[PDB]
Write a protein that binds this DNA or RNA. Structure first.
Ligand SMILES: [K+]
Ligand SMILES: [K+]
Ligand SMILES: [K+]
Ligand SMILES: [K+]
Ligand SMILES: [K+]
Ligand SMILES: [K+]
Ligand SMILES: [Mg+2]
Ligand SMILES: [Mg+2]
Ligand SMILES: [Mg+2]
Ligand SMILES: [Mg+2]
Ligand SMILES: [Mg+2]
Ligand SMILES: [Mg+2]
Ligand SMILES: [Mg+2]
Ligand SMILES: [Mg+2]
Ligand SMILES: [Mg+2]
Ligand SMILES: [Mg+2]
Ligand SMILES: [Mg+2]
Ligand SMILES: [Mg+2]
Ligand SMILES: [Mg+2]
Ligand SMILES: [Mg+2]
Ligand SMILES: [Mg+2]
Ligand SMILES: [Mg+2]
Ligand SMILES: [Mg+2]
Ligand SMILES: [Mg+2]
Ligand SMILES: [Mg+2]
Ligand SMILES: [Mg+2]
Ligand SMILES: [Mg+2]
Ligand SMILES: [Mg+2]
Ligand SMILES: [Mg+2]
Ligand SMILES: [Mg+2]
Ligand SMILES: [Mg+2]
Ligand SMILES: [Mg+2]
Ligand SMILES: [Mg+2]
Ligand SMILES: [Mg+2]
Ligand SMILES: [Mg+2]
Ligand SMILES: [Mg+2]
Ligand SMILES: [Mg+2]
Ligand SMILES: [Mg+2]
Lengths: 91, 124, 110, 128
RNA sequence: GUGGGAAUCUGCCGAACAGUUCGGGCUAAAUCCCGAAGAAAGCUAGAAAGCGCUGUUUGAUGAGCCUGCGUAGUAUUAGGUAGUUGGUUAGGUAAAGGCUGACCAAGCCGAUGAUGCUUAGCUGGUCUUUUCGGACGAUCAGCCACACCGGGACUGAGACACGGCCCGGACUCCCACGGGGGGCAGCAGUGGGGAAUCUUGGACAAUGGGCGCAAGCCUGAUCCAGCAAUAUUGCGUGAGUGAAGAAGGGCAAUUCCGCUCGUAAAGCUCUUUCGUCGAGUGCGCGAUCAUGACAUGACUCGAGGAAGAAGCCCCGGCUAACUCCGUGCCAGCAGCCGCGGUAAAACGGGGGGGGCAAGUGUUCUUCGGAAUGACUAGGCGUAAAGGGCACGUAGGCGGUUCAUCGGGUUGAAAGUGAA
């Protein structure tokens, strides 16, 4: 299918950690429980910040835990910079 | 509780203690009698009931009741012990089986005698 | 090797056989690739025996090279999917027979 | 939508038990209008009118004393086209009288029409 | 368990395409080993165009590896990790990869419960239950782990190999005393523990497997017998008739053959299912071209005489079923309420009766009844139970219209859901 997640960690070289979301159907009580799985992914150029929504593609094992390749960054996270904030404040 | 509460914490079961722990989930045990004595019941009933302190094969010290009329139990005597308490005597939780090991059957018993180990009398 | 063989069903003194395609190292009553049909070794009320087979599946396994065992060769020949076994060209062992007719309902001689 | 839908349905039942003639519902929704249309077709309310549906809606409903209870589900409930009758035999309190209203790709239907159209969806509620 | 993936191997079996040349070595030879070309290996006119091997394309079957989802209890366990998390480069593997050597960065897991502790093989399923759940994982079948306890590799397509090898340890048996040998958690069987669980059987006739061109040889896999009321909606223990209402037993204002056991028994007529005994055919059948342990069986016929076959619990209420005698708060019974102190339907015996029936009672364990952990399907003023009161993190829940999209949802089709 299509796996879309939010990046939660980018402090490795050529690697990101992406959190994916799913809904588990609790059959006895007939409600849906949100569950989370964290996935480690490959990103050669080191471009993903913390907070962006990326899409994952399956691949062969690249490390002990890295099994996914980042394919496209859907929505880019917003970053506040104080100096550029004051620069746009002056205008 | 709300359904969210039941999802986060489930439902437990009721607390109930085991009655016959010394049997250890077995129907009968084999024991050796340490003492054979009498005890008075709880009032208003007044009698002298025959009990025997039995050390079981798993090294447990229990009190057993002796059924029927008359007995021939001695000390260091091998008896078979089954579950089932006696209401008059507090702390006595077991019975001795008549008719096996050394505890003999009762001759002359005619009604309900297989509970006391008596053999079937000969029809003449 | 993939083989077409028989697996035992039924109960004690009452046999029944299932024609199954199995791997050769599998147990007699164990793992199988497919089930292909049934065979009743006992004679029925019509004076004959009963057999059912999956013709397309047996065709597929024979085309990919399965080796039928020695009774399955006989049953596939009588079903007309294989050539006859070599030892059937020999003729029966003749001799006298107890041809006294028996009443079918009572089992006594007529 | 579920909170305001159950809000209006409980308003309707509470005013039915007092023997009133009309009720006013605000806020409203298109799902609520379609639910009321199903009730009017099955004969549990006489008429309903929608006022100012694109700025601030209000709905006036005329009652006659025929509806016993209306519920709207406050949770998500999926149903397929072949589970409708078995679900209906366990949802309605009497298991005979009453209609389960589900939402489908073909629209907001009741449970008897959706069997004929062979389409499932989300259960909205029921009235009996 | 269920569904997938790419970075690999695959003896035997099916189908193509090409070869099978020459020296040496093991006391003697080779389809055993070494070398050269390109890889090899030859046998048979006894199997001469019939087997076998090697290389290259492929089908089929297995195997290695990776992975999404789902899968105990415990917070009176809150921090864990240092090859640990990633990167580069080398080595290794049939194969991706921290699998590991060197170097570089400080990451990785965790309040959506890491780690610590306790317990446990998992599934298809078994028992119970108006659906849900609960207990179990015993037989049979699929996967995994283990083979006296620890550690290794060799051969091999495939093992780190239950009845193969090497090393260490404990136990054990021989020794000629130098040292060797052994692993029933394979089928029987023996001590020990226990409340308790089986024959030191027959045969490869059927099915399956190994070797062999076949002929055939092995197979405690299996098939079939033995023991055990351990289980299962089975069958039988006779069908009629019989009043001298026999004898005898029990009870009685001691009523109506005084009431009952009682047409019950004895006796008379009939028929022999199951079992007993004696014989006969057997390509009846499991098996066909032939091959029958079971089989002293089964089938058919004959002999017989109701002949060989009914117990267990209960009778105060719950709960179907009552009287006499002995005992005297003693002996005793008991699942709960309770009975027994001189007229006991409750203790023990006589008689009579009720319920099941080759069974029937006691104990242990599970579910239901139990709405007695309440999703289906409960509660918190006075009965068990609203935090002393708020603010807020995660989480949960939450207005209206118009348009776009297709992850959830939904309809159809295909694959899969072993037996
Ligand atoms: K834990
Ligand atoms: K499976
Ligand atoms: K070992
Ligand atoms: K055989
Ligand atoms: K029994
Ligand atoms: K008899
Ligand atoms: Mg790995
Ligand atoms: Mg264990
Ligand atoms: Mg119930
Ligand atoms: Mg389990
Ligand atoms: Mg066992
Ligand atoms: Mg080998
Ligand atoms: Mg090798
Ligand atoms: Mg071996
Ligand atoms: Mg062994
Ligand atoms: Mg054994
Ligand atoms: Mg013993
Ligand atoms: Mg064979
Ligand atoms: Mg062969
Ligand atoms: Mg029976
Ligand atoms: Mg007979
Ligand atoms: Mg005979
Ligand atoms: Mg025959
Ligand atoms: Mg026999
Ligand atoms: Mg009564
Ligand atoms: Mg008296
Ligand atoms: Mg009683
Ligand atoms: Mg009595
Ligand atoms: Mg319950
Ligand atoms: Mg509730
Ligand atoms: Mg309550
Ligand atoms: Mg409240
Ligand atoms: Mg308060
Ligand atoms: Mg308080
Ligand atoms: Mg819209
Ligand atoms: Mg969609
Ligand atoms: Mg389908
Ligand atoms: Mg099945």
């Amino acid at each position: 299918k299509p796996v879309i997640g939010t990046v939660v960690s980018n402090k490795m070289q050529k690697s990101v950690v992406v959190a994916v979301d799913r809904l588990f159907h609790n059959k006895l009580y007939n409600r849906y429980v949100k569950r989370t799985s964290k996935f480690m992914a490959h990103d050669e150029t080191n471009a993903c910040n913390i907070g962006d929504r990326v899409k994952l593609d399956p691949s062969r094992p690249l490390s002990k835990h890295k099994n996914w390749i980042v394919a496209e960054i859907i929505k880019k996270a917003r970053i506040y910079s104080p100096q550029a904030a004051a620069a746009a404040a002056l205008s | 509780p709300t359904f969210n509460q039941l999802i986060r914490h489930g439902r437990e079961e009721k607390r109930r203690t085991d009655r016959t722990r010394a049997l250890d989930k077995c129907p009968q045990k084999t024991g050796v009698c340490l003492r054979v004595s009498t005890r008075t019941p709880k009032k208003p009933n007044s009698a002298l009931r025959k009990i025997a302190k039995v050390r079981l094969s798993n090294r447990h010290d229990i009190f057993a009741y002796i059924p029927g009329e008359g007995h021939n139990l001695q000390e260091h005597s091998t008896v078979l012990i089954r579950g089932g308490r006696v209401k008059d005597l507090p702390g006595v939780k077991f019975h001795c089986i008549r008719g096996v090991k050394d505890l003999m059957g009762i001759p002359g018993r005619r009604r309900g005698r297989s509970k006391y180990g008596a053999e079937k009398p000969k029809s003449i | 090797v993939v083989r077409l063989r028989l697996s035992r069903l039924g109960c004690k003194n009452r046999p029944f056989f299932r024609v199954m395609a199995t791997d050769s190292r599998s147990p007699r009553d164990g793992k199988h690739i497919e089930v292909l049909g049934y065979f009743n070794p006992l004679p029925g009320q019509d004076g004959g025996k009963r057999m059912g087979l999956k013709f397309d599946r047996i065709k597929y396994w024979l085309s990919v090279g399965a080796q039928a065992s020695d009774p399955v060769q006989r049953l596939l020949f009588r079903s007309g999917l294989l050539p006859p076994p070599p030892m059937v060209a020999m003729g029966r062992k003749g001799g006298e027979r107890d041809t006294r007719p028996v009443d079918p309902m009572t089992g006594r001689f007529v | 939508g579920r909170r305001i839908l159950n809000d209006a349905l409980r308003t309707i039942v509470n005013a039915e038990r007092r023997g009133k003639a009309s009720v006013e519902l605000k806020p409203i929704s298109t799902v609520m209008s379609s639910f009321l249309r199903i009730m009017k077709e099955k004969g549990y309310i006489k008429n309903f009118q929608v006022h100012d549906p694109h700025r601030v809606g209000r709905i006036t409903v005329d009652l006659q004393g025929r509806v016993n209870d209306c519920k709207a589900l406050t949770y998500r409930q999926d149903v397929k086209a072949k589970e409708i009758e078995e679900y209906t035999e366990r949802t309605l309190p009497t298991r005979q009288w009453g209609y389960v209203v589900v939402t489908t790709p073909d629209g907001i239907l009741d449970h008897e029409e959706a069997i004929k159209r062979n389409v499932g969806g989300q259960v909205l509620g029921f009235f009996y």
